[PDB]
Coordinates of C-alpha atoms and ligand atoms in Angstrom, one line a residue:
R1 CA 88.5 42.8 162.5
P2 CA 90.8 40.2 164.2
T3 CA 89.5 36.6 164.4
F4 CA 88.6 35.6 168.0
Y5 CA 88.7 32.3 169.8
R6 CA 86.7 31.1 172.8
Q7 CA 88.1 29.5 175.9
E8 CA 86.7 28.5 179.3
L9 CA 88.8 29.7 182.3
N10 CA 87.7 29.1 185.8
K11 CA 84.0 29.0 184.9
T12 CA 84.3 32.2 183.0
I13 CA 84.1 32.4 179.2
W14 CA 86.9 34.3 177.5
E15 CA 86.6 35.4 173.9
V16 CA 89.8 37.2 172.7
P17 CA 91.6 38.1 169.4
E18 CA 94.0 35.3 168.4
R19 CA 96.7 38.0 168.9
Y20 CA 96.6 37.1 172.7
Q21 CA 97.9 33.6 173.4
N22 CA 98.4 31.4 176.5
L23 CA 95.8 32.9 178.8
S24 CA 96.4 32.3 182.5
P25 CA 94.2 33.4 185.3
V26 CA 95.7 35.7 187.9
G27 CA 92.7 37.6 189.0
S28 CA 89.1 37.4 190.1
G29 CA 86.7 39.7 191.9
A30 CA 83.8 42.2 191.8
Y31 CA 86.0 44.4 189.5
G32 CA 86.1 41.6 186.8
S33 CA 88.3 38.7 185.9
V34 CA 92.0 39.1 185.0
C35 CA 94.3 36.8 183.0
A36 CA 97.9 37.1 182.0
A37 CA 98.5 36.7 178.2
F38 CA 101.2 36.7 175.7
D39 CA 100.7 39.5 173.2
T40 CA 102.2 37.9 170.1
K41 CA 102.2 41.3 168.3
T42 CA 104.8 42.8 170.7
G43 CA 106.3 39.7 172.3
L44 CA 105.4 41.0 175.8
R45 CA 103.1 39.4 178.5
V46 CA 100.0 41.5 179.1
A47 CA 97.1 41.7 181.6
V48 CA 93.7 41.2 180.1
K49 CA 90.6 42.2 182.1
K50 CA 87.1 41.1 181.2
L51 CA 84.6 43.4 182.9
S52 CA 82.0 41.5 184.9
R53 CA 78.5 42.3 183.6
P54 CA 79.3 45.8 182.2
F55 CA 75.7 46.6 181.3
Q56 CA 73.7 44.9 184.0
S57 CA 72.6 48.1 185.7
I58 CA 73.0 51.9 185.4
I59 CA 75.7 51.8 188.0
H60 CA 77.5 49.0 186.2
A61 CA 77.1 50.7 182.8
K62 CA 78.5 54.0 184.2
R63 CA 81.5 52.3 185.9
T64 CA 82.3 50.4 182.7
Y65 CA 82.4 53.7 180.8
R66 CA 84.4 55.3 183.6
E67 CA 87.2 52.7 183.6
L68 CA 87.4 52.9 179.8
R69 CA 87.7 56.7 179.8
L70 CA 90.2 56.7 182.7
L71 CA 92.5 54.1 181.1
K72 CA 92.3 55.8 177.7
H73 CA 93.5 59.0 179.2
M74 CA 96.4 57.9 181.3
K75 CA 99.8 58.2 179.6
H76 CA 102.5 58.1 182.3
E77 CA 105.3 55.6 183.3
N78 CA 104.0 55.1 186.9
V79 CA 100.3 54.7 185.9
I80 CA 98.5 51.8 184.2
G81 CA 97.4 52.9 180.7
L82 CA 95.3 51.2 177.9
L83 CA 97.2 49.0 175.5
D84 CA 94.1 47.6 173.9
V85 CA 90.3 47.3 174.4
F86 CA 88.0 45.0 172.5
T87 CA 84.7 43.2 172.3
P88 CA 83.6 40.0 170.4
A89 CA 80.5 41.9 169.3
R90 CA 80.2 43.2 165.8
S91 CA 77.4 45.6 166.6
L92 CA 76.0 47.8 169.4
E93 CA 73.1 45.4 169.4
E94 CA 75.3 42.4 170.2
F95 CA 77.6 44.5 172.4
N96 CA 77.7 42.9 175.9
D97 CA 81.4 42.2 176.8
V98 CA 84.3 44.5 177.3
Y99 CA 87.9 43.5 177.6
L100 CA 90.7 45.9 178.6
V101 CA 94.5 45.3 178.1
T102 CA 97.5 46.8 179.9
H103 CA 101.1 46.0 180.9
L104 CA 101.8 43.0 183.1
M105 CA 104.6 43.9 185.5
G106 CA 104.9 40.5 187.2
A107 CA 104.3 41.0 190.9
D108 CA 102.7 43.4 193.3
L109 CA 104.3 45.2 196.3
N110 CA 103.2 42.5 198.8
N111 CA 105.0 39.8 196.8
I112 CA 108.2 41.9 196.5
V113 CA 108.3 42.5 200.3
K114 CA 107.6 38.8 200.9
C115 CA 110.8 37.8 199.1
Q116 CA 113.1 40.7 199.8
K117 CA 114.0 42.9 202.7
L118 CA 113.8 46.5 201.4
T119 CA 116.8 48.8 201.8
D120 CA 116.3 52.5 202.5
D121 CA 117.2 53.2 198.9
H122 CA 114.5 50.8 197.7
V123 CA 112.1 52.7 199.8
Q124 CA 112.9 56.1 198.3
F125 CA 112.7 54.7 194.8
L126 CA 109.3 52.9 195.3
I127 CA 107.6 55.8 197.2
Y128 CA 109.1 58.3 194.7
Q129 CA 107.4 56.5 191.8
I130 CA 104.1 56.2 193.7
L131 CA 104.2 59.9 194.4
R132 CA 105.2 60.7 190.8
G133 CA 102.2 58.8 189.4
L134 CA 100.0 60.4 192.0
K135 CA 101.0 63.9 191.0
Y136 CA 100.0 62.9 187.5
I137 CA 96.6 61.4 188.3
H138 CA 95.8 64.1 190.9
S139 CA 96.5 66.8 188.3
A140 CA 93.7 65.3 186.1
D141 CA 91.4 65.7 189.2
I142 CA 91.4 61.9 189.7
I143 CA 91.8 60.1 193.0
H144 CA 92.8 56.5 193.5
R145 CA 91.0 56.2 196.9
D146 CA 92.0 52.5 197.4
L147 CA 95.8 52.8 197.2
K148 CA 97.4 49.7 198.8
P149 CA 100.3 47.3 197.9
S150 CA 98.1 45.0 195.8
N151 CA 97.3 48.0 193.6
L152 CA 101.0 48.6 193.0
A153 CA 102.6 46.6 190.1
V154 CA 106.4 46.2 190.3
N155 CA 108.8 44.8 187.7
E156 CA 112.1 43.0 188.4
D157 CA 113.9 46.3 188.2
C158 CA 111.7 47.5 191.1
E159 CA 110.0 50.0 188.7
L160 CA 106.4 50.8 189.6
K161 CA 102.9 51.4 188.1
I162 CA 99.8 52.4 190.0
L163 CA 96.8 50.1 189.3
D164 CA 93.0 50.4 189.4
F165 CA 92.7 54.1 190.4
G166 CA 89.7 56.3 190.1
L167 CA 87.3 53.4 190.4
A168 CA 86.4 52.8 194.0
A169 CA 92.6 44.5 203.9
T170 CA 91.8 47.8 202.1
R171 CA 91.1 49.5 205.5
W172 CA 94.7 49.4 206.8
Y173 CA 95.6 52.1 204.2
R174 CA 92.4 54.0 204.2
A175 CA 92.3 57.7 205.3
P176 CA 90.5 58.4 208.6
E177 CA 88.0 60.9 207.0
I178 CA 86.8 58.0 204.9
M179 CA 86.4 55.5 207.8
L180 CA 84.6 58.3 209.7
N181 CA 82.3 59.0 206.7
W182 CA 83.1 62.7 206.8
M183 CA 81.6 63.9 203.4
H184 CA 83.4 65.6 200.5
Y185 CA 87.1 64.7 200.7
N186 CA 90.3 65.6 198.8
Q187 CA 93.1 64.1 196.8
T188 CA 95.3 63.7 200.0
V189 CA 93.3 60.7 201.0
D190 CA 95.8 59.0 198.7
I191 CA 98.7 60.6 200.5
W192 CA 97.5 59.0 203.8
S193 CA 97.6 55.7 202.0
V194 CA 101.1 56.3 200.8
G195 CA 102.1 57.0 204.4
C196 CA 100.7 53.7 205.6
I197 CA 102.5 51.9 202.8
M198 CA 105.8 53.6 203.4
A199 CA 105.7 52.9 207.2
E200 CA 105.0 49.3 206.4
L201 CA 108.1 49.1 204.1
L202 CA 110.2 50.5 206.9
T203 CA 109.0 48.6 209.9
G204 CA 107.8 45.3 208.2
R205 CA 104.5 45.5 209.9
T206 CA 101.0 47.0 209.5
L207 CA 100.9 50.4 211.0
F208 CA 97.2 50.4 212.0
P209 CA 96.2 46.8 212.6
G210 CA 92.6 47.4 213.5
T211 CA 90.3 44.3 213.7
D212 CA 87.6 46.7 212.6
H213 CA 87.4 50.4 211.6
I214 CA 86.9 51.6 215.2
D215 CA 89.9 49.7 216.6
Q216 CA 91.9 51.1 213.7
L217 CA 90.7 54.6 214.2
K218 CA 91.8 54.5 217.9
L219 CA 95.3 53.4 216.7
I220 CA 95.5 56.2 214.2
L221 CA 94.5 58.9 216.8
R222 CA 96.9 57.3 219.3
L223 CA 99.8 58.0 216.9
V224 CA 99.0 61.3 215.1
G225 CA 97.3 62.7 218.2
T226 CA 93.9 64.1 219.2
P227 CA 92.5 66.6 216.6
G228 CA 93.6 70.1 217.5
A229 CA 91.3 73.1 217.9
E230 CA 92.0 73.9 214.2
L231 CA 90.8 70.5 212.9
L232 CA 87.7 70.3 215.2
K233 CA 86.8 73.7 213.9
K234 CA 86.1 72.3 210.5
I235 CA 83.8 69.5 211.7
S236 CA 80.2 70.8 211.7
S237 CA 78.4 67.7 213.0
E238 CA 78.4 67.9 216.9
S239 CA 78.1 64.1 217.0
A240 CA 81.1 63.8 214.7
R241 CA 83.3 66.0 216.9
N242 CA 82.3 64.3 220.2
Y243 CA 82.8 60.8 218.7
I244 CA 86.2 61.5 217.4
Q245 CA 87.4 62.8 220.8
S246 CA 85.9 59.7 222.4
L247 CA 88.2 57.6 220.1
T248 CA 91.4 59.4 221.2
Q249 CA 91.5 58.1 224.7
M250 CA 94.3 55.6 224.2
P251 CA 97.7 56.5 225.7
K252 CA 99.6 58.7 223.2
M253 CA 102.3 57.1 221.0
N254 CA 105.4 59.0 219.9
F255 CA 106.0 59.2 216.2
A256 CA 109.8 58.9 216.4
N257 CA 109.6 55.9 218.6
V258 CA 107.5 54.0 216.1
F259 CA 110.0 54.4 213.3
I260 CA 113.3 54.1 215.3
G261 CA 116.0 52.9 213.0
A262 CA 114.8 54.5 209.8
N263 CA 116.3 57.4 207.9
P264 CA 115.6 60.7 209.7
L265 CA 114.4 62.2 206.4
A266 CA 112.0 59.2 205.9
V267 CA 110.4 59.9 209.3
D268 CA 110.0 63.6 208.6
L269 CA 108.3 62.8 205.3
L270 CA 106.1 60.2 207.1
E271 CA 105.0 62.9 209.6
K272 CA 104.0 65.2 206.7
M273 CA 101.9 62.5 205.1
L274 CA 100.2 61.0 208.2
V275 CA 98.6 64.3 209.2
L276 CA 95.0 64.0 210.6
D277 CA 93.9 67.3 208.9
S278 CA 93.8 66.5 205.1
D279 CA 94.2 70.2 204.4
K280 CA 97.6 70.1 206.0
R281 CA 98.8 66.9 204.5
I282 CA 101.7 67.3 202.1
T283 CA 100.6 66.9 198.4
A284 CA 102.2 64.6 195.9
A285 CA 103.9 67.4 194.0
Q286 CA 105.2 68.8 197.3
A287 CA 106.4 65.4 198.5
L288 CA 108.4 64.9 195.3
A289 CA 110.6 67.9 196.4
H290 CA 111.2 66.6 199.9
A291 CA 114.9 65.9 200.7
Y292 CA 114.2 62.2 201.1
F293 CA 114.0 61.9 197.3
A294 CA 117.1 64.0 196.6
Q295 CA 118.6 61.2 194.5
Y296 CA 115.5 60.8 192.4
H297 CA 113.7 64.1 192.2
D298 CA 113.7 65.9 188.8
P299 CA 111.2 68.8 188.2
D300 CA 111.7 68.4 184.4
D301 CA 110.5 64.8 184.4
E302 CA 107.5 64.8 186.7
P303 CA 104.6 65.8 184.3
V304 CA 101.0 66.4 185.0
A305 CA 98.1 65.1 182.7
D306 CA 96.4 66.7 179.8
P307 CA 93.0 68.1 180.6
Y308 CA 90.6 65.2 181.5
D309 CA 87.0 65.5 180.5
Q310 CA 85.0 63.8 183.3
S311 CA 81.8 65.8 183.1
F312 CA 80.1 62.4 182.6
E313 CA 80.5 61.9 186.3
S314 CA 77.8 64.4 187.2
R315 CA 75.5 62.8 184.6
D316 CA 72.5 60.5 185.2
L317 CA 71.9 58.5 182.0
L318 CA 70.0 55.3 181.0
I319 CA 71.8 52.0 180.5
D320 CA 71.5 52.2 176.7
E321 CA 73.1 55.6 176.8
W322 CA 76.1 54.6 178.9
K323 CA 76.3 51.4 176.7
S324 CA 76.4 53.4 173.5
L325 CA 79.0 55.9 174.9
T326 CA 81.2 52.9 175.9
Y327 CA 80.8 51.2 172.5
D328 CA 81.8 54.5 170.7
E329 CA 85.0 54.6 172.9
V330 CA 85.9 51.0 172.0
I331 CA 85.6 51.8 168.3
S332 CA 87.5 55.1 168.4
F333 CA 90.4 53.5 170.3
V334 CA 93.9 54.1 168.8
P335 CA 96.7 52.1 170.4
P336 CA 99.8 53.9 171.7
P337 CA 103.2 53.9 169.8
Ligands
LIG1 O1 96.1 40.5 191.1 S1 95.4 41.4 189.7 O2 94.2 40.5 188.8 N1 96.7 41.9 188.7 C1 96.5 42.8 187.7 C2 97.7 43.2 187.0 C3 97.6 44.2 185.9 C4 96.3 44.7 185.6 C5 95.1 44.3 186.3 O3 93.9 44.8 185.8 C6 93.8 45.3 184.6 C7 94.1 44.6 183.4 C8 93.9 45.3 182.1 C9 93.5 46.7 182.1 F1 93.4 47.4 180.8 C10 93.2 47.4 183.3 C11 93.4 46.7 184.6 C12 95.2 43.4 187.4 N2 94.5 42.7 190.5 C13 93.1 42.4 191.0 C14 92.4 43.6 191.3 C15 93.1 44.6 192.3 N3 92.4 45.9 192.3 C16 91.1 45.8 192.9 C17 90.3 47.1 192.8 C18 89.5 47.4 191.6 C19 88.7 48.6 191.6 C20 88.8 49.5 192.7 C21 89.6 49.3 193.9 C22 90.4 48.0 193.9 O4 91.2 47.8 194.8 C23 94.5 44.9 191.6 C24 95.3 43.6 191.3
LIG2 C1 88.9 63.9 213.1 C2 90.0 62.9 213.1 C3 89.6 61.6 212.4 C4 89.2 61.9 210.9 C5 90.2 62.8 210.3 C6 89.7 63.5 209.1 C7 90.5 64.7 208.7 C8 89.9 65.4 207.6 O1 90.6 66.7 207.4 C9 90.1 67.4 206.3 O2 89.0 66.8 205.6 C10 88.6 67.4 204.4 C11 87.4 66.5 203.8 O3 87.8 65.3 203.6 C12 88.1 68.8 204.6 O4 87.3 69.4 203.8 C13 88.6 69.5 205.8 O5 88.3 70.7 206.1 C14 89.6 68.8 206.7 O6 90.1 69.4 207.7

């Protein structure tokens, strides 16, 4: 058992193995607190996340276990995986804090764009990697559902890793079916997000700048058009159908016009991602074969994930059960090569 050392950072107490040195806050929110640290074992900077109050409630307890399970399963170059997980506690009885460790890339997509004007080749590489990671997570039946530039870690070689998936402004990249609260959705909500991100990288501006969700929904419908007979056919709720038609009264926008000077292939791909009907949206695996990624696509190097056991998701357990399951996972953790 490594020796730990305590430290107070921005009001929050951090107790970590001496292995991690020079803690530096990067990170704060409802998801927990995040610090950058120097992993002296490998010589590389890492990201350390201290979960808020992991076992405060059943919902907290379950999401603590969830994130631990998720990270322990992901092993892909475009997806954050678990480098280490630890707790200062020596027993289940004293177990109250959980720390997760992963790669620190250095910047997020917003930062990259802030400093550099992306070339079309940059766009293919960045989106290609997002889609490649997405094919992987989606294959394990996991959905990000909050894909956005701040959830995209990029290193100085513009290589990318998807961050904080399977856990959930955010709205700009959110799929319309979510903003409309239509129930039971699919993996392509992430594809819609990728479309909003890609458009942004091409035009340099937010595609659907809605002050609120309604304003934004009107902007979405204005661009991808009123729902056809086919889509309206799958919406049961009469109130839902009427309301959506009521939001598509803005003058129609032409898709090609919005993305003028961009690569023709880029625009075609954008059209296949920003489809109102999620059943007709291109999937990540399909997207990877699109001609826009000709220079990067390789079917022998775009793997899917090992079977992921998430039967715990349809389980309603007590705090102490969720806590014990989490503790067992912390103990059984074996670091990667
Ligand atoms: O600016 S960051 O503090 N940088 C960062 C960079 C790398 C890893 C990381 O979090 C970790 C750290 C260690 C782990 F093992 C897992 C995640 C955070 N961070 C803050 C949180 C943000 N995601 C919020 C978020 C959380 C849950 C659900 C939807 C969401 O959008 C993503 C970016
Ligand atoms: C109606 C236009 C604004 C909202 C667009 C939502 C488009 C959803 O599209 C799809 O959603 C899935 C559930 O998420 C389905 O199960 C569908 O049948 C479907 O068509």
